[PDB]
Amino acid sequence: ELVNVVDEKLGTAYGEKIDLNNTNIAAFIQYRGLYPTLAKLIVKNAPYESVEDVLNIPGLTERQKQILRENLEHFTVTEVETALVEGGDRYNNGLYK
Amino acid sequence: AIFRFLLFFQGFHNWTLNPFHMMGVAGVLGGALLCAIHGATVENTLFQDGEGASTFRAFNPTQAEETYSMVTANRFWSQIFGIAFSNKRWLHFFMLFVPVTGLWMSAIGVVGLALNLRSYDFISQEIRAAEDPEFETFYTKNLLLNEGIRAWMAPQDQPHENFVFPEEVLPRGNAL
Amino acid sequence: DQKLGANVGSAQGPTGLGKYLMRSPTGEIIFGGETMRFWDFRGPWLEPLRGPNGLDLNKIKNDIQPWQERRAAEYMTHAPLGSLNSVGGVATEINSVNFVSP
Amino acid sequence: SANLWERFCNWVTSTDNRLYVGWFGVIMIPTLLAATICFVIAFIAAPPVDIDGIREPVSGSLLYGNNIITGAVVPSSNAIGLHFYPIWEAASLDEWLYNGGPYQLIIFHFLLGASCYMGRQWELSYRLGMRPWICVAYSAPLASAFAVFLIYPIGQGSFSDGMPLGISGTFNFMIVFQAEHNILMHPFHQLGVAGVFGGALFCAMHGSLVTSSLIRETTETESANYGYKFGQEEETYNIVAAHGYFGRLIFQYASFNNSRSLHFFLAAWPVVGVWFTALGISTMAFNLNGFNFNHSVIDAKGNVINTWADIINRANLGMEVMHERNAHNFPLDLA
Amino acid sequence: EKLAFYDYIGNNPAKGGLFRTGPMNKGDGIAQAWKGHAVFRNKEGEELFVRRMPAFFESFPVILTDKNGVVKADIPFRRAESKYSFEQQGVTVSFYGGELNGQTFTDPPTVKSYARKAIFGEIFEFDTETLNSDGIFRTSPRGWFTFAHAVFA
Amino acid sequence: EKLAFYDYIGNNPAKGGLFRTGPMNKGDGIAQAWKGHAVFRNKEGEELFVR
Amino acid sequence: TLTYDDIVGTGLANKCPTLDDTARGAYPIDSSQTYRIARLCLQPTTFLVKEEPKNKRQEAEFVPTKLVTRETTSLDQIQGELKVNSDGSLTFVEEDGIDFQPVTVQMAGGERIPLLFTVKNLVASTQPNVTSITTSTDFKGEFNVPSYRTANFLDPKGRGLASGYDSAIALPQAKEEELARANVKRFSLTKGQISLNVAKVDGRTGEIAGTFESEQLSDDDMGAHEPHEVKIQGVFYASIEPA
Amino acid sequence: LNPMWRQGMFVLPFMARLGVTGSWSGWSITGETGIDPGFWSFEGVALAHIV
Amino acid sequence: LNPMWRQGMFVLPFMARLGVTGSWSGWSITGETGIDPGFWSFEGVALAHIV
Amino acid sequence: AELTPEVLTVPLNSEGKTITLTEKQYLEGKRLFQYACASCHVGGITKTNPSLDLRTETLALATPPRDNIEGLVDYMKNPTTYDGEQEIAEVHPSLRSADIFPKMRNLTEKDLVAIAGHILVEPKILGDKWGGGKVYY
Ligand code: CLA
Ligand code: CLA
Ligand code: CLA
Ligand code: CLA
Ligand SMILES: CC(C)=CCC/C(C)=C/CC/C(C)=C/CC/C(C)=C/CC/C(C)=C/CC/C(C)=C/CC/C(C)=C/CC/C(C)=C/CC/C(C)=C/CC1=CC(=O)C(C)=C(C)C1=O
Ligand SMILES: CCCCCCCCCCCCCCCC(=O)OC[C@H](CO[C@@H]1O[C@H](CS(=O)(=O)O)[C@@H](O)[C@H](O)[C@H]1O)OC(=O)CCCCCCCCCCCCCCC
Ligand SMILES: [Ca+2]
Ligand SMILES: [Cl-]
């Protein structure tokens, strides 16, 4: 049947925590020291099979890995949704103030 | 406080799309034309009754001859517009009729807006717009403008309703 | 956004036209958005990014200079939009920045 | 033959023509026939136009689902901007109708002809020995069409931003304009409605005063109009009885007794008022908008105390935030 | 049922249009039965309330608040940052008395459908077939008589 | 298909009525496709023909 | 070489570079030295739209169409590695570039057929054992065709997928089952086929040229109607370099 | 659920406000049966005026 | 299966009998594409007479 | 309903210590805020990057914390990204870059304290308005 994949996504982990595989980059601005450098790395570094897989990003300094560990409770992960990832919408989804 | 009355009527009643309002403007706009056109037609079809350039003094406050060539005026317009008056009595009655009839029509339209019996939509249009997502007219466009007006104004324009419209419920295009 | 890791060259906007870069009617690579109407603009700050076919995706990708970024920022926040009473911005803006382009 | 060309010039300029095809007419008559014929065909059978250059065609013709009130001739694409788009600039007509080609062909020919129409309104006045200036009254409505069809587009950087050729299409032009420029709060527009309201007012004033002070020459059961013959020597109304009444309505010195001073005012008012309204659209075409009193009156602590000026801003944001849904990609609307 | 029926905006003479001809039935359709009172609740069991449609509005948004008027749930426009979507709140709907009496619905779409309906007051079951209705409100005789005479006068 | 179509009485001009207005399509409907030749047979295998 | 001004308004900018009749040589592949494509470019020449055989399945063919938009069709600035494979073949793998252009073409009836002509995520391959790239050294592979309109796009009535209205707000009390398809927006994602067959090599500077043929689906308009099959023929130009 | 004011009735209500609430065919505005409106039924009123 | 004579066309056939078999929009009576009818297309004929 | 010194009491440093501004400093800040910020920071937002605003909470979760006089002042001298892992004085007005941003030349330590104070006092007065954009206008 016909369903709005996005409105359905909001009934899962996404919609409750920062989805490492879908959620737009700006969402990382709600936690200390994640935005610029790390959010870019997280988003840029394709999907993850589990939240912890973020700790495995090649190059992460020991401090970055520390920070990531702290905020894991604010992340989750769900199937990559095209409607939410296509068009590069994770770097700019047409929303501002 | 009157400009919002205008904007309101657009947003809520889609007043501009009302047949009576249109007649209204047709009368006021058309009435402001007769005013201008007749005035100019007279000042530039005047007879010479003085030796000065400022022909204002050259006027006979005590009737007698016509101060402007009604016969010349007729021929002028009859050649530039194709149609032209030729009975000052009618030309002047016309000038009463046009703007007075206009305002009367614009009134009726509002008398209907009282009961909210507006001229908001065209049903045939909405039905096709529902089934077919690629059908777009300057009409559909306008209705969306109304939606925005209502949603963004209603809160501070109707305090007694204690409206609270979460940012996420607020209709908005892209980027803006 | 490019600094945030976005590939400007292949970015697809809502209409499917090209969020950041698109083509003009005669084939040249220009900026996207409503700004497609001003693809005839030439200027010191922007020229070094233009190639023989219009905006070069390689220069744009790594030759943007800081003086240009702040130039763009400066001019962006100083567009010739204002009110009679001299309130810079869009008719819906708030009072604060008293300015109207010469 | 007294000399063909010499004759030609005598015919053209002839004041014995049913319609005075003038010298200006020689340019007018063809340009206006192109504009009208193209319009009528467009409005009836033209296909959808991608006005906003974002590949989202807006159909505005009858045969494509429109009626008189909604239907319109859609402005050229925004991808075209201010570029000249003549039929011979398109790979095919199919491409030309899609990019809103007809619009330019229409606006350019009309504005051209409508100008010559003014030039003619002088010429005939010359050939007939009457004073000029009538054409100067017509300079106001023309200067508006110009402002709405050419000045605003030049200023805004695209013809896609010019007023559409249709009823609803015009309402769109207004609603959006207001949002981006807050025109109701601009002096020039206010003077415009003053001229228009005033016009209609005075038009009713004169009209009534005169018709009400007509010298009786008609039966009780005979049209009061017949009491006038085309080509009269004396006047058909008592301008002294007229002034007598109106002078008592308000007060003597606030009433006209000089038909010439009356008629000048009658013409001067609307034309001057509309001149400013035309200058309004032409001024706001360079983003010098109406007064912005947003968050002006604030209280002792700093809180913002709203005025009707603010309630207007909300209504404006709605229009702003909703117009051209998919056309914006960035924060500020600078186009 | 009769009593519930009067509590439906589709009988408010202030809804309608000048050229929206015919009976009120060519609009929402011939009323068949009262589906019942709809009570909306969210995961915590809290009972929500649907903000009704003021006659002024042709279209109105779906917003849900508690007794104190605090917005608890709604149907978002831009989902990008929605905090109260029916999904995130586990909103459900239950009916009492009427067609849907004793039943409950929990799948977001169905819940939102009825929520979208609650806005007009008591939810009813219409027969749109017969008169080939279009689903656009029309005014009552009270409304027409009032308009005609206000004009004539 | 075209050839088969001509062998259909619904294209015979002698069928119709004086006040049966409109195109032939308002009648039997817009032709979409040829279902095919129908061959009728009875228990004995004999082939029958429709008058 | 020509400057920007030497091309502006001529339409030349929407034209992939060309090699002269001479350049019909062959470029060598070290197989122990990584190679990449500094610039792949695709220029459309024709857009054919396979017609729906009506109900009467009679086998359908592709038909030419008029380009209703203008000279904005070309794909340029494509880039990626041209890794050499064990069996001695070559596979190109795109990374980034102007890899898509929204094209709209009309047909016999007058129907506009919009498509998102692209080659996103290209993975072209060649014949096994290809020490040197000769004339006609077929490249074949698939790519991805994302929805024409992205998530944020709103239809004339405000309805959208990632944003916009939930239903037909213009018909407050209408049955919804019929309107289902047009209210619920779906984001289509599909595969495409393309083949780049060389025609001109130039081992000297390492820049090959040729012609391509690709097939893909057109816009389904947020899943409101079925997509049309499209075939696209044109020419290409690639700049191979060691790097 | 389907009273006169839902069926775009305009004259029928003014006839009930003063007494006429039945039809010669048996039914009645209030919804009763077996009632005998006599001659002054909606039909009756309508008849009268025509004459 | 759906030629002019099924669509209640009356003038369209008389225009094909003498040559005009195409439209400025691209299609053609015989069912071909890419054809260029020139000016004398059904539209053309229709245009001419009006003038 | 007035700007009491109770409202002009904003956090001075990270260690809880506070400072109390005066109606003179406030107005002065407000004036300076217009002179060198409004251009891009009108009403607490950020035109050239709408993702980061001047909301006290936003400044609180910044890195280092910029939700106090000390914080904001440092920033106005040597600006950094939200995680602080990168100095941006080259594309953001600051003291160490007044040659590039002339408006910042006049600005003296007195001025910097006022501007900083303004940023912390505004939300106290306007509330939600200060952070959000057109939605709250
Ligand atoms: C082409 C553009 C156009 C035009 C020509 C008109 C024209 C008109 N509109 Mg209109 N309108 C437009 C666009 C336009 N509109 C748009 C875009 C909108 C937004 C949707 C509206 C919304 C709108 C509304 C909501 C209304 C109109 C109305 C009217 C009409 C009545 C105006 C009148 O004469 O007041 C005359 C004012 C009076 C009330 C007359 C009595 C006033 C006394 C005599 C004056 C006393 C003065 C005093 C002595 C001096 C003291 C003052 C002191 C300050 C000195 C008029 C026909 C109104 C109408 O239709 O009402 C019937 C109306 O309600 N319009
Ligand atoms: C209550 C009736 C009323 C009145 C008094 C006004 C009055 C006015 N409207 Mg207005 N308006 C009304 C209803 C009314 N409106 C309605 C119902 C609508 C539609 C919703 C509008 C829509 C509207 C618009 C859109 C605009 C106005 C504007 C104006 C102002 C200039 C209009 C003008 O030039 O008229 C033309 C008529 C004249 C030429 C008569 C002039 C008479 C004036 C009032 C002076 C009177 C003299 C004064 C009494 C002093 C005499 C004392 C002396 C003898 C000692 C004016 C103050 C304009 C404005 O805002 O400008 C600032 C404007 O843009 N109105
Ligand atoms: C004024 C008294 C009146 C009233 C209040 C009603 C009311 C009603 N009638 Mg009705 N009717 C009336 C008189 C009246 N009728 C008369 C005299 C007749 C005999 C012709 C009918 C015949 C009739 C029928 C046959 C039907 C109704 C129906 C209905 C109902 C549906 C409403 C409707 O269709 O609106 C329609 C309203 C309009 C379209 C508005 C008309 C406004 C016009 C267009 C304005 C014209 C402007 C003018 C040209 C401008 C020029 C002026 C300029 C030159 C200066 C409604 C209760 C229907 C019903 O049965 O419902 C089930 C129905 O089927 N009526
Ligand atoms: C005689 C030439 C002629 C012919 C052969 C046709 C034939 C046709 N037309 Mg047609 N048409 C014609 C002239 C003609 N038209 C003209 C002049 C017009 C302009 C008004 C039209 C306008 C027109 C339209 C708009 C349409 C057609 C259509 C059609 C087709 C459908 C057939 C039809 O509807 O039958 C209808 C036949 C009748 C109802 C018979 C009328 C007989 C009357 C009732 C007799 C009157 C008797 C008289 C009063 C007695 C008084 C005498 C007594 C006092 C002594 C058909 C091919 C339709 C088509 O397009 O199909 C898809 C269609 O939509 N035509
Ligand atoms: C292909 C298709 C279908 C095309 C469609 C195109 C399109 C969309 C068109 C739609 C048009 C449309 C339907 C518009 C609706 C508007 C309309 C009909 C409104 C309703 C009108 C109405 C009943 C309302 C009442 C208000 C009213 C009475 C206004 C009337 C205004 C009116 C007619 C004024 C006429 C003004 C005018 C130009 C007259 C000039 C007269 C003249 C030449 C005088 C010159 C002159 C001056 C002198 O001084 C002297 C001395 C002489 C001698 C003299 O001559
Ligand atoms: C690409 C180029 C195309 C060129 C086209 C070919 C040339 C033009 C052919 C014209 C054929 C049509 C004849 C028209 C007759 C006529 O108008 O009246 C006949 C009168 C009498 O003419 C008088 O007529 C006299 C002859 S007679 O009286 O007609 O017998 C004659 O002797 C005298 O010279 C003459 O002035 O014509 C005139 O008074 C001259 C003015 C003609 C004005 C032309 C139309 C103006 C249109 C303005 C724009 C309107 C826009 C659309 C609005 C709907
Ligand atoms: Ca097809
Ligand atoms: Cl719009």
Coordinates of C-alpha atoms in Angstrom, one line a residue, chain D residues 169-291:
Chain D
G169 CA -2.5 36.3 -12.8
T170 CA -2.7 39.9 -11.9
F171 CA -3.9 39.2 -8.4
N172 CA -0.8 37.0 -8.0
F173 CA 1.4 40.0 -9.1
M174 CA -0.3 42.1 -6.4
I175 CA -0.3 39.7 -3.4
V176 CA 3.4 38.8 -4.0
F177 CA 4.4 42.4 -4.6
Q178 CA 2.9 43.5 -1.3
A179 CA 4.8 40.7 0.5
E180 CA 8.2 41.7 -1.0
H181 CA 7.7 45.5 -1.0
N182 CA 4.9 46.3 1.5
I183 CA 3.3 48.6 -1.1
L184 CA 0.3 49.6 1.0
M185 CA 2.8 51.3 3.3
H186 CA 4.3 53.4 0.5
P187 CA 3.5 57.1 -0.1
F188 CA 3.4 56.7 -3.9
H189 CA 0.7 53.9 -3.8
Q190 CA -1.4 55.9 -1.3
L191 CA -1.3 58.9 -3.6
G192 CA -2.3 56.4 -6.3
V193 CA -5.5 55.3 -4.6
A194 CA -6.1 58.9 -3.6
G195 CA -6.1 59.8 -7.3
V196 CA -8.3 56.8 -8.2
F197 CA -10.8 57.1 -5.3
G198 CA -10.8 60.9 -5.8
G199 CA -11.2 60.5 -9.5
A200 CA -14.3 58.2 -9.1
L201 CA -15.5 60.7 -6.5
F202 CA -15.1 63.8 -8.6
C203 CA -16.3 61.9 -11.6
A204 CA -19.5 61.4 -9.7
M205 CA -19.4 65.0 -8.3
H206 CA -19.2 66.7 -11.7
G207 CA -21.4 64.2 -13.4
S208 CA -24.2 64.7 -10.8
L209 CA -23.9 68.5 -10.3
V210 CA -24.1 69.1 -14.1
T211 CA -26.9 66.6 -15.0
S212 CA -28.9 67.9 -12.0
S213 CA -28.6 71.5 -13.2
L214 CA -29.9 71.0 -16.7
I215 CA -32.1 73.7 -18.3
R216 CA -35.6 72.2 -19.0
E217 CA -36.4 71.7 -22.6
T218 CA -37.9 68.2 -22.3
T219 CA -41.4 66.8 -21.7
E220 CA -42.4 65.0 -18.5
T221 CA -42.6 61.8 -20.4
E222 CA -39.6 62.4 -22.7
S223 CA -35.9 61.6 -22.1
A224 CA -34.2 64.5 -20.5
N225 CA -31.3 63.8 -22.9
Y226 CA -33.1 65.0 -26.0
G227 CA -33.0 68.5 -24.6
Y228 CA -29.6 68.7 -26.3
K229 CA -28.6 68.9 -29.9
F230 CA -25.2 68.0 -31.3
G231 CA -23.6 71.3 -32.3
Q232 CA -25.2 73.7 -29.9
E233 CA -24.1 77.3 -29.5
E234 CA -25.1 78.0 -25.8
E235 CA -24.6 75.7 -22.8
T236 CA -27.1 73.0 -21.8
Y237 CA -26.8 73.5 -18.0
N238 CA -26.9 76.3 -15.5
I239 CA -23.3 76.3 -14.2
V240 CA -24.4 79.2 -12.0
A241 CA -27.2 77.2 -10.4
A242 CA -24.7 74.3 -10.1
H243 CA -22.2 76.5 -8.2
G244 CA -25.1 77.9 -6.2
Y245 CA -26.0 74.5 -4.8
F246 CA -22.5 73.1 -4.3
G247 CA -21.4 76.4 -2.8
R248 CA -24.1 76.0 -0.1
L249 CA -23.3 72.3 0.4
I250 CA -19.8 73.1 1.8
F251 CA -19.2 76.9 1.5
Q252 CA -18.9 79.3 -1.4
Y253 CA -15.1 79.7 -1.8
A254 CA -14.7 75.9 -1.7
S255 CA -16.7 75.6 -4.9
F256 CA -15.9 76.1 -8.6
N257 CA -17.6 78.7 -10.7
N258 CA -15.1 78.6 -13.6
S259 CA -15.8 75.6 -15.9
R260 CA -12.2 75.8 -17.1
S261 CA -10.6 75.7 -13.6
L262 CA -13.1 72.9 -12.8
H263 CA -12.2 70.7 -15.8
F264 CA -8.4 71.3 -15.2
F265 CA -8.8 70.0 -11.7
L266 CA -11.0 67.2 -13.0
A267 CA -8.1 66.1 -15.2
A268 CA -5.1 67.1 -13.1
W269 CA -6.1 65.1 -10.0
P270 CA -6.3 61.5 -11.3
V271 CA -3.4 61.9 -13.8
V272 CA -1.1 63.3 -11.2
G273 CA -2.2 60.6 -8.7
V274 CA -1.7 57.8 -11.2
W275 CA 1.6 59.3 -12.2
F276 CA 2.9 58.8 -8.7
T277 CA 1.4 55.2 -8.4
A278 CA 3.3 54.5 -11.7
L279 CA 6.5 55.9 -10.1
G280 CA 5.8 53.7 -7.1
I281 CA 6.0 50.5 -9.0
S282 CA 9.0 51.9 -10.9
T283 CA 10.7 52.9 -7.7
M284 CA 10.0 49.7 -5.8
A285 CA 11.5 48.0 -8.9
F286 CA 14.8 49.0 -7.3
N287 CA 13.8 47.7 -3.9
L288 CA 13.1 51.1 -2.3
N289 CA 10.0 49.8 -0.6
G290 CA 7.3 51.1 1.8
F291 CA 7.7 52.2 5.4

